[model samples]
Target chain A: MNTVPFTSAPIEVTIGIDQYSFNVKENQPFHGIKDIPIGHVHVIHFQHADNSSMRYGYWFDCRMGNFYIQYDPKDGLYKMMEERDGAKFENIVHNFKERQMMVSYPKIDEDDTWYNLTEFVQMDKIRKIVRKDENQFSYVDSSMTTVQENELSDPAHSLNYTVINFKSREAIRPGHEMEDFLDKSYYLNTVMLQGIFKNSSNYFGELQFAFLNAMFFGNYGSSLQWHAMIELICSSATVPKHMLDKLDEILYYQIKTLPEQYSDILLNERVWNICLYSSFQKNSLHNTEKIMENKYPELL
Target chain B: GAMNSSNYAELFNNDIKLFVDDTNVYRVTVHKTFEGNVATKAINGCIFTLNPKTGHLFLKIIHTSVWAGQKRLSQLAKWKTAEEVSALVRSLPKEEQPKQIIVTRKAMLDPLEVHMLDFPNIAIRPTELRLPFSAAMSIDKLSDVVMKATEPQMVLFNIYDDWLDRISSYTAFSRLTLLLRALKTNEESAKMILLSDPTITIKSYHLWPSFTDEQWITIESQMRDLILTEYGRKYNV
Candidate 1:
């Protein structure tokens, strides 16, 4: 008996950040960015050599600049205040400077309590704005709405509903672009869907997300088409062969048995609760597509 | 005793009839079978396996025609058996003689299919990185590039969500495509679960629901496990 073992060559990976580079090894302890004392010490700068200006909130999280989970407001603001005192605004020249990069106090809006890292400082080396150009991926028109209102309600009317409503609904503008939202519920929702955020509902949330995307991207329409077609077909018991043949042409022969296949994970007694509680705060997933389609036509 | 060593080997795959009244065993050959929509010949025969030297304590088997149903058995067992043996035989029934199943080996289905499907996206080209890390690094690099360039936490989140959506799209498509191919290849009920949706339709018939809850759960787990296992190491970095 002869035996030949399988072998593949060892792999090498190199990562270059700025002018510095690190060669990371698999299963090796990486303390490259450890013990840096992350928060408000380094300058938050906006650099733009081209038409598009670049902006990022940089603080040492887990002693690493790239750690996303470390930026949760509770820890971020506590560390910033204990060390820096929201010191970034020492030389505030404009109302935007008051918007904050390192804030000291956390505040609660309608849906969430803020992760406040309010620090004020003046570093000529790290100015807030990049090259001033109207054509840049500029933030003049960028705003996220937190106010939930009926489709018929006036967009401006929500701004005046309450003091907290007024403050939360107000856009942070480009000046506060570097200000990190500790209670960014929507951002959390998105990242959670991407499976980046841990301890979050993955399967059904992902399914809901994909269904919406199929409706929009229209890539391989049959999956969604089969879903919709089956629903429409089942709506009326026994129909025309011509229509059925057309449906068959669109989908594989197996698609006819979708009802037997389409069990909802959200409805399963064990799984449904765990996922929905973590992923969607809403009670029901029924007609979520219709609701989402009506809200974001581009995503539909 | 009108038989040779060839007769003993051939009987392992064929069907034979035993006539109790006459105390005789007759080879039953069922011909004209189909393999992947192609009509082919199947001559099933059997012989009692008595040792050529001793002719005692005999074993018997029925030998059927070339892949009339043999292909299904081989492919099914090939996966279950060790891949080294699988690779040696390439398809199975392994050489002519049976060896330890531990020696059998075959390539993983997902990796091979991923290479085939994702080839257009980015070519590995470099033979050195044909394994898991090379593939993982490429995906991570692309994702990192996108994440860094996207500003405003909300915008970045949207972009990441889009990436997941793209991944799920492929999951839905890939499972269905593979399932259909499996069904068409096996052409038998012995190995239908590999189709991803194993539902008993009407006794002999089976349905592959690419979008079934079972498929959704399987693929959903696969998508998360594969992507995270691949990307989670470097995602924060």
Candidate 2:
């Protein structure tokens, strides 16, 4: 038998949530919570072979973009951004003596990450994902809700994603330089990306849009502060590629599907620039404005 | 047996008892008017209901798709306006028309559902089913919203009643009531705003939920004067 609980059945979840509200009037900040690793959380509970149950909480830094969490019964600890060939790793462990989650790169790296476990644990209980700038602690009291496990997803194995190297446009977040941003979410790939990737379609639009807007227009400041802002923006994105792809594809796709509010987005002029910016032979940018003005001629 | 209705303190203060019986058709009660009066005594609706969890902030009494809601005086008596109801009383020999109308509750096969819009200084609009916050938030999140709200937007919990296949007994009313009393508090100083509009008559259309119905309700209620009342009332005379 494995040291941890086991169920071979596949599971799933919708992972991009920035804020988690809790009912403070009920108990201590740290009451009745699991020993979950930071940056990894899971609400999926499975019935064990012996009639009991087990579920490991999974967490991912959205900054990781498509980077995700994976767990195996024998490993007993969760892994972050592990590759298929088993090239490298990061793992989160519970320091029972300290009662905290410690990060180790599948093995060696260590750091004091997400030491405050109570809030993270409280957030996992409710479904209204917070999309706020300050990420304030809402004093709202939501009763503990049971999430149907089917929404629990295996996004990593499911989606086809693209990678954006920070170096090419890597002017921001000078440190932690190697991590690449993915173009798709882990839950679903080509089909999912195409279906739900539009701005009007999902709440995730503002996040992706604002980040790119800054990347394109932010003032070059000497302070290390804007880097934090960049990290937050990159982390919030479900995909750096989706933003680029959506921008590039708007030219190729039907005009009505995207709508004129496209002007509100930086989608108009720069649409051709960034897509072609990095590539040796870009399929495309400012020519889009000409086509846009021609199509909606009313803009003239 | 008592009828199933959770009337509000607002209704109580207005002397409106939303007495409705699910079993007996037309159980008689006095001084309880539905939406019309026999002798120009009343016009317009008094009782409205909403489910806090799923409803936008508009409330209504009857519609094709709801539950526990009864017909309007226009709907019940088949007179679309109080003038028509008043005409019937006038048609009667003077001794017959009731000074006080006695309305009754009866069983019905349906539910019902509308509005118009604007305001100044603060925002006023029909809130989507779940906007900015969800049912999973704490009352403090709600209370914090109003108190910490630097934005002058007044979110309308219009509580549209068309989705009547729901309940009135279990509602967020208890917590919301607690939230408003706690507001004991608005704005950056000059923006203390009060929101009101009882004339929410137009229902959502299958064609378009907005476009016109919402515009008229806002106009009818003189919602334009709303913000004017706020800053205009405070300005040096």
Candidate 3:
């Protein structure tokens, strides 16, 4: 015999003709609603099984996204929930005291299933419609008072949840190496490189073009920095060492003029250069640490 | 071995425009405007061609056969422009060409300067065309239009309508609205006029679900900041 309350036969709810069964096992507290993760919902499913043996409940048609009592932690008793885009969901009519959750299949022709939570949960109750609105929260019961928009709009009173998942918010922060001039140079170099890659159809043509352009024209100092960086990345592939050496000679020529500034800039370029190139090498992660230790000891 | 004004006029007649920059690899934007009374719009269609040097016969064949008959407006703009530009490039003089043809869309050069024969900043002709629309078919008609047009007749279909349809689909309208508002804030009055007219505004709003006013405004501000950074100087917006 199952000890937990909600752990019974799998609860089957139908959305139209398509049926989905959610397992409410006593042992698996983390079991989520279908494919959706558990974190998005409130109940552990055990709570609802404790309330009723029928393994059935109501679905509130909020006209927004529908709400199901199948796994609701509040027993479908919550006044409000948060929207996806940081908007507040205000309730129309909510009754915490009501034992059986009252709901309706607004579009159904059958008078038999309307407001009936005692039997099976119908499709209309949980059709993923938007349930809460700011103006008025309406339900099947008349005695329940509406939760006004203004009352819930305030940050203090609202149960507004910020629904942004972790990864998207993390990407918004300023990237590492965001504060340096070397970082700016690296960014501009990457942009120009991307532009060139897009514009040129021929691989050898682009390589030869970048080599010549960097050595002789267009901000010779910055061009050599870019050439050195590209050579570091591409040398493992088709780009020959002799060609790269020719670029190295030109880079050294440009570096000879301003020893202090060019040396520091070159070091920064080389450090980043190894960092990018090492990512693609075999045992790349381990090799990155090894290379950083040998050459860019300061970075390590 | 020198090409003349008549040859330049012939190239212009075929709707071919060229741009010059520091790079040897040439980048080209082939554009066709979908016409509408409310707003004329265009796609910044792009393709790359090998650099042709002076005293060389330009003999490159541009292939636009794949994108020739796509149902979408964005695809159509790419198709038409590629067809037009490719045909123009094919018609260029076989005679020895000048080392470089420096071209600009701006009106900085004198139109009648005979001495400026070596480098002519020619005016790029603009295509002002409209897309087909009907009040009876409404939103339901857009999908039908996409399905119906084909072959030689497909080019005649109003791509502006298709373009409007694409941007008005769900989240796109919300983003497009923000882009328009950003352009407005930048005082690019010319761009603003082309973005959304009264009819477009009404139709776009009808397509959108009820997002809160605050959420819409917030999104618009964010979009404005992005557009200002990327397109502020380019469009003078």
lDDT of each prediction vs. the true structure?
0.24, 0.27, 0.29
The residue-by-residue lDDT of candidate 2 on B4-91, one tens digit each, is 2433333223222221111111123346347665332222121212223334331112221221254444344222112222333345
lDDT per residue (tens digit) for residues A153-220 in model 3:
33332211112111121211223211111122222223322333332122222333222222222223
Model 1 segments beyond 4 Å from truth?
A1-50, A60-108, A111-300, B1-237
Residues A194-241 of candidate 1: C-alpha lDDT, one tens digit per residue = 334232222222222222222212223213322322332322223344
Candidate closest to the true structure, highest TM-score: 3
Task: Please give, as one word, the docking class of candidate 1.
Answer: incorrect
* Candidate 3 per-residue C-alpha lDDT over B1-237 given as tens digits, one digit per residue, 9 for 90 to 100: 123343433322323333221111122355454563343222212222212111111212223333434445442333333343334343456342222333221121111111222223333231111111111122223224323434222212121223333333324323433543444444344234333333334234132223345545554665566556758677776
Where is model 3 chain B poorest over a 10-residue stretch in terms of lDDT? B127-136
Angstrom error at residue A266, model 2: 40
- Per-residue C-alpha lDDT of model 2 across residues A1-300, encoded as one tens digit per residue: 001111112222211121121221211222112223444322222222332222222322322222333444475422333223322212211222134322112211363222211122233221122222222121111111112121324332111111222223322222211122222132122222344433322322222222222222221110112222223222333445544444433333323223455434423233233233333224333343446556655433
